[PDB]
Design a protein around this ligand. Structure first.
Ligand code: CLA
Ligand code: CLA
Ligand code: CLA
Ligand code: CLA
Ligand code: CLA
Ligand code: CLA
Ligand code: CLA
Ligand code: CLA
Ligand code: LHG
Ligand code: ZEX
Ligand code: SF4
Ligand code: SF4
Ligand code: SF4
Lengths: 80, 142, 729, 75, 40, 139, 31, 75, 75
């Protein structure tokens, strides 16, 4: 499956979680930003790698990065 | 003895044979004769067409040097007026809007001041604000 | 699933992609699962043994097929009037017309006509009988067996080399310079003097009597007494006939220069002294680096000493960078090999070495095109693997402030000035070509812009070309350079001033324009490859590209779009420009040599100044015989070449739809096909094991490029061979 | 009309049916598909969905038009 | 399809194996190997 | 276990395939306040009935697309849908929402996953980690 | 002079040896 | 009058209006997908012909793909 | 010509051109002549549209010139 990493430059705008179509991301409490919340990727085995979360991130460089890796049936998003 | 393979067009038999039937480029009926006269002083090959020699020699300065100077002057004019207009509009409040909607007064004011572009360029280089320092330019990660 | 055993993430893939990617990463040993440095090096050692064995088997097969189904013994009796035969034809799908058409060159069965020029090579090196070819083939079989066994042996546990053995640069350089390069050249010189020259002078020399036949009459005493000039006295006269004793001298090392009057090729004794001298120089060079005695240089201290006040750290720490990185070494080797392959082509079309090979125009054109294309491929690969090194093996802290780091510092200046030079060449070359086209089309070809290539003509004069009246250096009879009493000067000046060869062909405005176009192509391909290599680590759009590897599809439609931001994509784009530049190069070479061989140089001279002449006089005019290989009326020997011409056009077209149409369309189409298969009775009994999916983005680009390149090569090869064979062959 | 006319007319039929296939797949699958089930929300003119799902290049209806233009040219 | 070289009968039998027998056997072996589930 | 009247649908060719009975399928259940027309993610329009509903789909993405349509394109917003994974043996795994609170809003008791204590520019160089089965982000 | 059938057969038999060695090398490299 | 004997005019007219027709057909294929993405509303289309088309679209596309392959192959 | 020119846009992507534009922007910035309207590589959809437009233009113009010359040269 693909890997999703969230770095300490997150501002907790929650756009990445909203943009995710397969419910891979989550919002957890934090303290490094003013919003006091950071993104997380618990359900990372369902990620397909559409990079919508990366597109939604407004930081100078993406505070959320997706590294495509091993391909499963879920990762390929196959219906057969 | 230079260019033993290139003969003057005034004596090259192919050029003289083909210059009688020169086509008229414009509505003037003797434009072909004028072209034949003007090209009879060049260096023609075995097939009778003029060849331009560009090695620095001043006997053939008309081939490259004079058009080179003309083009360099014109291109420097264009570049200098463009750069000056850009730098001038950069201090305003909407530099991007003046990029698509040209400030014709200021545009023409810079248009007419470009004939002294070499003096302005050398003064710019000596003043040190023609070229920015490497540490003041955004750069991509190595 | 077992396959692929070297990657677990691929083995757990349930789709057909596992089959594809497993092939693509098979020979990438670094990224294999649980791979160490020592295992990597030993596996590479064995694989290199394998490639060498394959090369020897290929050469043995060439020899065997030529000796078995060829006409070598008949060809040597008349090299100027008999077509060499490559291999026999056995095709049950043939018809009567094809059988009649392909029975050529005096054979009794359908045969092919060899264009690799191996007959001339075998004749020049002394092979004259079929049994000699057969013995060579068997010996090469044995050699390949020995190398395969050597790979197996040095792969065994007791014979596995250590990491320290592989990282011994000094000993490897010494042995491979003095031994691999020097001793081999000395052995070839000995073969030429002991065997090749006597056979060229009519004396048969073989394993049976080469011990009782001295090369020189007064032999082996002057070499030790120092009276070497004895071996240069009595050279082959101008009336010598190759392979006979008529007019043949006794010298074995000369400096005659020029070409043999009959074979139009370099003198054999000149080759002997040349390879002997370079063998001596290489053996001297091979005693340079310290290995385990007191004497000898060490590369590390030489590199760490040559540092200046402008480059900062200079060449410091470069030894570790080159030694630890295999991709750096591969890139350096590929660059050098490509440069010397281009050199082989350029110095082999103009200075033929094999007897009667200058008169076989088809083989000359084929050899030039082949080795130039090989050189282009190697030159692309050098930059590709250098970018791979920058992605993987480059350590910024170790190579700090040295030349390697300084490259990445002014990389923006590099790319900007390279873009400027590419644009500057392209704009004013296309402008001149289009201006000439428009002016000629309007019926007034006198107003063309024709620039004489003054500088190249001056260089030709400096070498001795007395046609332009420059009267400089070697063309100057009173210059000190022309009054040194050099033994090669008369022959070289005779050959260069003769218009019957390709030695420094005459040039004109068309050659000027096409050489500047070639310069544009070279600088543009270099621009693409260099920007890819320098931006491989990262750019403003992707500051962290190195984390994503060398080859990845994209980074999605966000942040602008990405779409071929990887360095692999830079290589993929540069392949097209390499092919285009090679096409321009080969078109120029082929048209100029067609004019030279037919004697109609004026056609090229006055028609290459405008692009319509290129389109009409070269492409349209020379396809008349090729496309008529098979007609509604019959079939001639060019039928196979016409079929391959159309085949190449077809494959070139087919690559376009892997290059243009992209994945999602085919993915949805395959979804529909999967539904159709699963819903069909009597077909539901058969089911797939790997879920069918569309090809990946990078795989699609690779497959499109592969079909494209195959079509390009096949089309041009067919056209060139057919045109030259019909015109001259 | 002879053998050549037969071959060319059926070639015409093949090319026309293929162009119709491309445009019909564009029209019918513009709303959604098994690969991307929400293409309608992405719009009509979007380049892709991403490198995920193996690669989702040229899935919009506009891309189907872009692909059908070439086949119309060929036919 | 008929030749005058020595041992002209060899291509009559060698080419089919290189044409059919060897490609088919290689196809079968590779297909079995790449599809053999497990054990790696 | 899983209860709800299936929405009235005429049947389409875009539905499940052998993967549903071989690997897994997905189920989405929601409470509708009125029998009204909604859009199948697999193609077509079907009416959903007042009360409980239950729909079987082939992919999690299809289920979440249907959930998005339910949440956005209906004035009586349907925020109560639940997405489960149904295995061929019979096991049903609750997938969405995880803890009953939508992931968009922060809820206490969650655990950070995949979070790195550095920024994207501080990743290690590949040359320092080569010949090990690791990637710069994996470290 | 042209070859004989025995020469071709002997060449085949000789080439049978590098085939066996190449098979061994391939099996060793796969390991 | 005098058009049939002017072969250039015949060829030009045929090819010109041929190209115009092809472009317009492709434009139909495009703007239909535009309608489907934007103006199609499932609420007003229940069991009507449009919905039935959207239901057996896989069968249509599969059979059309097969006929395209068959035509191209044999011709 | 134009057909071949179109193969610039159909065969390539926009990240390469974006990086090249980054380098050229650095060049223009060194001389303090950088434009206020930041230059960007064409979008993916725009790239495809430009490629298909120039491709069709080149092909159709080639066919038009060929047909007109042949038909005017056959009496
Ligand atoms: C290698 C490239 C090269 C370059 C850069 C130049 C550059 C130059 N050449 Mg030149 N030249 C070259 C090759 C070159 N040459 C060759 C190969 C020949 C032999 C055909 C000549 C023969 C030549 C003559 C005869 C003259 C020049 C002259 C000049 C200068 C012209 C000054 C000017 O207008 O500004 C210029 C510096 C002129 C000069 O003397 O300038 C001082 C001049 O009269 N050139
Ligand atoms: C790689 C070199 C090479 C190549 C390309 C060919 C090519 C050909 N040979 Mg040939 N041959 C070669 C070497 C080669 N030969 C050698 C060294 C021998 C001596 C043992 C022979 C003996 C031979 C005979 C006796 C006959 C041919 C025939 C033929 C033709 C039929 C196709 C074929 O090879 O299958 C048939 C031939 C073989 C199976 C010979 C065995 C192949 C050699 C010995 C091993 C090559 C392995 C190679 C390096 C593997 C590379 C792997 C790579 C693709 C990944 C064809 C033109 C036939 C012919 O003339 O038809 C018209 C025929 O009857 N060959
Ligand atoms: C239906 C069309 C057709 C077919 C089937 C053939 C078949 C043949 N022709 Mg032929 N030919 C044809 C049309 C055809 N021809 C036409 C129209 C012409 C023009 C008139 C010719 C002109 C012609 C000439 C001039 C010659 C042939 C020869 C041959 C033979 C070559 C032997 C061979 O293929 O083994 C060798 C097989 C290969 C090299 C395989 C290459 C293809 C694959 C894809 C490459 C491998 C990729 C990959 C590594 C594969 C992995 C392994 C795989 C098992 C998975 C073969 C019998 C030659 C011959 O008789 O010598 C023996 C020969 O000299 N033909
Ligand atoms: C005298 C001792 C000696 C010799 C002869 C060799 C020879 C070789 N070593 Mg080597 N080696 C040595 C000592 C030696 N080594 C030592 C001491 C070490 C340890 C420090 C190594 C460590 C080592 C490694 C680690 C490797 C080798 C490899 C190789 C082979 C590379 C293939 C090659 O270059 O041939 C082909 C090239 C030539 C013969 C010359 C190059 C051609 C020139 C440059 C240009 C062409 C000239 C001419 C115009 C072309 C002919 C034209 C003609 C066809 C008409 C080669 C056979 C590689 C291998 O795996 O091979 C099995 C390899 O990876 N060596
Ligand atoms: C001595 C030469 C040499 C060596 C040892 C290597 C070694 C390597 N290269 Mg390299 N390369 C070379 C030359 C070389 N290359 C050249 C000349 C080029 C330019 C073309 C490249 C371009 C290149 C790229 C772009 C990449 C590599 C990569 C690699 C690495 C492994 C992947 C690989 O190539 O296997 C897998 C190779 C293949 C699957 C090759 C498939 C292509 C087939 C052979 C084409 C067949 C054509 C077809 C059969 C024609 C049929 C004709 C018929 C119809 C008649 C490996 C370190 C890759 C890497 O990054 O790894 C670190 C990578 O991305 N190389
Ligand atoms: C015949 C087709 C063709 C042409 C003309 C070009 C031209 C160019 N390519 Mg290119 N390319 C092509 C095919 C082509 N490519 C293909 C098939 C590929 C494979 C995908 C590539 C891949 C490629 C890469 C990867 C790169 C280029 C680059 C370049 C530029 C280098 C500068 C140069 O060569 O001269 C200067 C340019 C020209 C002579 C072209 C201008 C021609 C016109 C006629 C000038 C006048 C414009 C005209 C007035 C506009 C009127 C429009 C109006 C009617 C609407 C140039 C713009 C490089 C680049 O950007 O360099 C900076 C680069 O990085 N190309
Ligand atoms: C690579 C080697 C190879 C060889 C040796 C052959 C040999 C043959 N092919 Mg062929 N073929 C090949 C590759 C090859 N093909 C490929 C790659 C393709 C795909 C394009 C084809 C497609 C093809 C077609 C479409 C046809 C042939 C046919 C034939 C046969 C015609 C000769 C004859 O007398 O027919 C009669 C020969 C026999 C009855 C002997 C049968 C051979 C043994 C006994 C079968 C067991 C002949 C045996 C024809 C055929 O099968 O005719 C019946 C035919 O119609 N071939
Ligand atoms: C009756 C005819 C007609 C009408 C009224 C419309 C109306 C519309 N179309 Mg449509 N279309 C048509 C025919 C028509 N189309 C045809 C025949 C095609 C197939 C090619 C298309 C393909 C099409 C697409 C793919 C798209 C539209 C879109 C649109 C909408 C406006 C946006 C637009 O295209 O403007 C902007 C127009 C341009 C930017 C065109 C300028 C560039 C052209 C192509 C250059 C032409 C060059 C010329 C032929 C030769 C010049 C040579 C040069 C050297 C001088 C609008 C609803 C867009 C949309 O989504 O709207 C909802 C959209 O994406 N149309
Ligand atoms: C025929 C091809 C012509 C075009 C090819 C490329 C044109 C590029 C020319 C631009 C200047 C290159 C940058 C200068 C590079 C630069 O100035 O480095 C500084 C270097 C001086 O080096 P130092 O003596 O400081 O020490 C260098 C060595 O000691 C080890 O680095 O200058 C040269 O060597 C100039 C010759 C380079 C050639
Ligand atoms: C000042 C200015 C600008 C900027 C200008 C800048 C920054 C310029 C920078 C230039 C640099 C850094 C380097 C320039 C190098 C120039 C070289 C190397 C010139 C070489 C000339 C040669 C080799 C002449 C050759 C022969 C000379 C001879 C006369 C014949 O022909 C024959 C022939 C062709 C051989 C702009 C661009 C911003 C705007 C402009 O309007 C003005
Ligand atoms: S790549 Fe797509 S599926 Fe994966 S986490 Fe990001 S938005 Fe979700
Ligand atoms: S979009 Fe980026 S900044 Fe916003 S919450 Fe997600 S990771 Fe943090
Ligand atoms: S390569 Fe394909 S998936 Fe990636 S950004 Fe471009 S269009 Fe989208």
């Amino acid at each position: 499956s693909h890997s999703v990493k969230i770095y300490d430059t997150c501002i907790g705008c929650t756009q990445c979680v909203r943009a995710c179509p397969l419910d891979v991301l989550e919002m957890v409490p934090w303290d490094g930003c003013k919003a006091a919340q950071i993104a997380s990727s618990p359900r990372t085995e369902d990620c397909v790698g559409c990079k919508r979360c990366e597109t939604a991130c407004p930081t100078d460089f993406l505070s959320i990065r997706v590294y495509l890796g091993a391909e499963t049936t879920r990762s390929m998003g196959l219906a057969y | 003895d230079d260019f033993a393979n290139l003969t003057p067009c005034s004596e090259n038999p192919a050029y003289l044979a083909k210059s009688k039937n020169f086509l008229n480029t414009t509505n003037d009926p003797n434009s072909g004769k004028i072209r034949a006269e003007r090209y009879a002083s060049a260096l023609c090959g075995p097939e009778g067409y003029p060849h331009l020699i560009v090695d620095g020699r001043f006997t053939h300065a008309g081939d490259f040097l004079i058009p080179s100077i003309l083009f360099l002057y014109i291109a420097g004019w264009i570049g200098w007026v463009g750069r000056s207009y850009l730098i001038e509009i950069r201090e305003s409040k909407n530099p991007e809007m003046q990029e698509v909607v040209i400030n014709v007064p200021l545009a023409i004011k810079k248009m007419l001041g470009g004939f002294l572009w070499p003096l302005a360029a050398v003064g710019e280089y000596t003043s040190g604000k023609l070229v920015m320092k490497d540490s003041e330019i955004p750069t991509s990660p190595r | 699933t077992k396959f692929p055993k070297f990657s677990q993430d691929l083995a757990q893939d349930p789709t057909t992609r596992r089959i594809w990617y497993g092939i693509a990463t098979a020979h990438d040993f670094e990224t294999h699962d649980g791979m160490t440095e020592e295992n990597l090096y030993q596996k590479i050692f064995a694989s290199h043994f394998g490639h060498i064995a394959i090369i020897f088997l290929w050469t043995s097969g060439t020899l065997f097929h030529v000796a078995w189904q060829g006409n070598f013994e008949q060809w040597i009796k008349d090299p100027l009037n008999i077509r060499p035969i490559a291999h026999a034809i056995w095709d049950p799908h043939f018809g009567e017309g094809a059988v009649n058409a392909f029975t050529q060159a005096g054979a009794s069965n359908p045969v092919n006509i060899a264009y690799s020029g191996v007959y001339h090579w075998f004749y020049t090196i002394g092979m004259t009988t079929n049994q000699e070819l057969y013995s060579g083939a068997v010996f090469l079989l044995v050699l390949a067996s020995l190398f395969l066994f050597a790979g197996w042996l040095h792969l065994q546990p007791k014979f596995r080399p250590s990491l320290a053995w592989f990282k011994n640069a000094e000993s490897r350089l010494n042995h491979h310079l003095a031994g691999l390069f020097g001793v081999s050249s000395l052995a070839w010189a000995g073969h030429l003097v002991h065997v090749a020259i006597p056979e060229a002078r009519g004396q048969h020399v073989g394993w049976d009597n080469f011990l009782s036949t001295p090369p020189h009459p007064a032999g082996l005493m002057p070499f030790f007494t120092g009276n070497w000039g004895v071996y240069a006295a009595d050279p082959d006269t101008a009336g010598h006939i190759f392979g006979t004793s008529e007019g043949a001298g006794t010298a074995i090392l000369t400096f005659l220069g020029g070409f043999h009057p009959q074979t139009e090729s370099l003198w054999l004794t000149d080759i002997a002294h040349h390879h002997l001298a370079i063998a001596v120089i290489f053996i001297i060079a091979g005693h340079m680096y310290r290995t385990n005695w007191g004497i000898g240089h060490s590369i590390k201290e030489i590199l760490n000493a040559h540092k200046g006040p402008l480059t900062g750290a200079g060449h410091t720490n470069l030894y570790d960078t080159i030694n630890n990185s295999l991709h750096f070494q591969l890139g350096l080797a590929l660059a050098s090999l490509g440069v010397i392959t281009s050199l082989v082509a350029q110095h082999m079309y103009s200075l033929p070495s094999y007897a009667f090979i200058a008169q076989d125009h088809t083989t000359q054109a084929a050899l030039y095109t082949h080795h130039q294309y090989i050189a282009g491929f190697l030159m692309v690969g050098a930059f590709a693997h250098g970018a791979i090194f920058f992605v993987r093996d480059y350590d910024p802290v170790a190579n700090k402030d040295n030349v390697l780091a300084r490259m990445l510092e002014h990389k923006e200046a590099l790319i900007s000035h390279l873009s400027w030079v590419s644009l500057f060449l392209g704009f004013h070359t296309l402008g001149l070509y289009v201006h000439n086209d428009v002016v000629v089309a309007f019926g007034t070809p006198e107003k063309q812009i024709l620039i004489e290539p003054v500088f190249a003509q001056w260089i030709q004069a400096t070498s001795g070309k007395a046609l332009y009246g420059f009267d400089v250096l070697l063309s100057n009879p009173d210059s000190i350079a022309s009054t040194t009493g050099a033994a090669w000067l008369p022959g070289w000046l005779d050959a260069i001033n003769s218009g019957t060869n390709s030695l420094f062909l005459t040039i004109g405005p068309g050659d000027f324009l096409v050489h500047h176009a070639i310069a544009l192509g070279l600088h543009t391909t270099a621009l693409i490859l260099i920007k890819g290599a320098l931006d491989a680590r990262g750019s403003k759009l992707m500051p962290d590209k190195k984390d994503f590897g060398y080859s990845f599809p994209c980074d999605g439609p966000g942040r602008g779009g990405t779409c071929d931001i990887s360095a692999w994509d830079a290589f993929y784009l540069a392949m097209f420009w390499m092919l285009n530049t090679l096409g321009w190069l080969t078109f120029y070479w082929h048209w100029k040599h067609l004019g030279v061989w037919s004697g109609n140089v004026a056609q090229f001279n006055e028609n290459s100044t405008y692009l319509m002449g290129w389109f009409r006089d070269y492409l349209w005019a020379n396809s008349a015989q090729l496309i008529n290989g098979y007609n509604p009326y019959g079939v001639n020997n060019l039928s196979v070449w016409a079929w391959m011409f159309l085949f190449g056009h077809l494959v070139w077209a087919t690559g376009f739809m892997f290059l243009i149409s992209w994945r999602g369309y085919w993915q949805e189409l395959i979804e529909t096909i999967v539904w159709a298969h699963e819903r069909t009775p009597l077909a539901n009994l058969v089911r797939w094991k790997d879920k069918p999916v569309a090809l990946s983005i990078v795989q699609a680009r690779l497959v499109g490029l592969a079909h494209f390149t195959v079509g390009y090569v096949l089309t041009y090869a067919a056209f060139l061979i057919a045109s030259t064979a019909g015109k001259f062959g | 009309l002879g053998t050549a006319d037969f071959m060319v007319h059926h070639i015409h039929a093949f090319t026309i049916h293929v162009t119709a296939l491309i445009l019909l797949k564009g029209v019918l699958y513009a709303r959604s598909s098994r690969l991307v089930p929400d293409k309608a929300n992405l719009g009509f003119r979007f380049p892709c969905d991403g490198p995920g799902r193996g690669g989702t290049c040229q899935v919009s209806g506009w891309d189907h038009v872009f692909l059908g233009l070439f086949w119309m040219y060929n036919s | 399809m008929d030749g005058s070289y020595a041992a002209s009968y060899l291509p009559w039998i060698l080419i089919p194996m290189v044409g059919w027998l060897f490609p088919a056997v290689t196809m079968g072996l590779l297909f079995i190997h790449i599809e053999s589930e497990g054990e790696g | 276990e899983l209860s709800g009247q299936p929405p009235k649908f005429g049947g389409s060719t875009g539905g499940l395939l052998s993967k549903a009975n071989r690997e897994e399928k997905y189920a989405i259940t929601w409470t509708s306040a009125s029998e009204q027309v909604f859009e199948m993610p697999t193609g077509g329009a079907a009416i959903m009935n007042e009360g409980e509903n239950l729909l079987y789909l082939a992919r999690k993405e299809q289920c979440l697309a249907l959930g998005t349509q339910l949440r956005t394109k209906f004035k009586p917003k349907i925020q109560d849908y639940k997405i489960y994974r149904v295995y061929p043996s019979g096991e049903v795994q609750y997938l969405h929402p995880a803890d009953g609170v939508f992931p968009e809003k922060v809820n206490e008791g969650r655990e950070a996953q995949g979070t790195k204590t550095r920024r994207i520019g501080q990743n290690p160089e590949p040359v320092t980690i080569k010949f090990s089965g690791k990637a710069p982000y994996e470290v | 002079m042209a070859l004989s059938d025995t020469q071709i057969l002997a060449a085949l038999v000789v080439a049978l040896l590098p085939a066996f060695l190449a098979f061994r090398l391939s099996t060793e490299l796969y390991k | 009058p005098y058009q049939a004997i002017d072969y250039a005019t015949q060829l030009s007219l045929f090819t010109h209006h041929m190209w115009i027709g092809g472009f317009l057909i492709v434009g139909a294929g495009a703007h239909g997908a535009i309608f489907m993405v934007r103006d199609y509303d499932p609420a007003k289309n229940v069991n009507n012909l449009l919905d039935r088309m959207l239901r057996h679209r896989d069968a249509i596309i599969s059979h059309l793909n097969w006929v395209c392959i068959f035509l191209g192959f044999h011709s | 010509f134009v057909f071949a020119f179109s193969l610039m846009f159909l065969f390539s992507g926009r990240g390469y051109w974006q990086e090249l534009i980054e380098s050229i922007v650095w060049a223009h910035n060194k001389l303090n002549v950088a434009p206020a309207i930041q230059p960007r590589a064409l979008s993916i959809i725009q790239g495809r549209a430009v490629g298909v437009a120039h491709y069709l233009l080149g092909g159709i113009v080639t066919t038009w010139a060929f047909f007109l010359a042949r038909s005017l040269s056959i009496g």
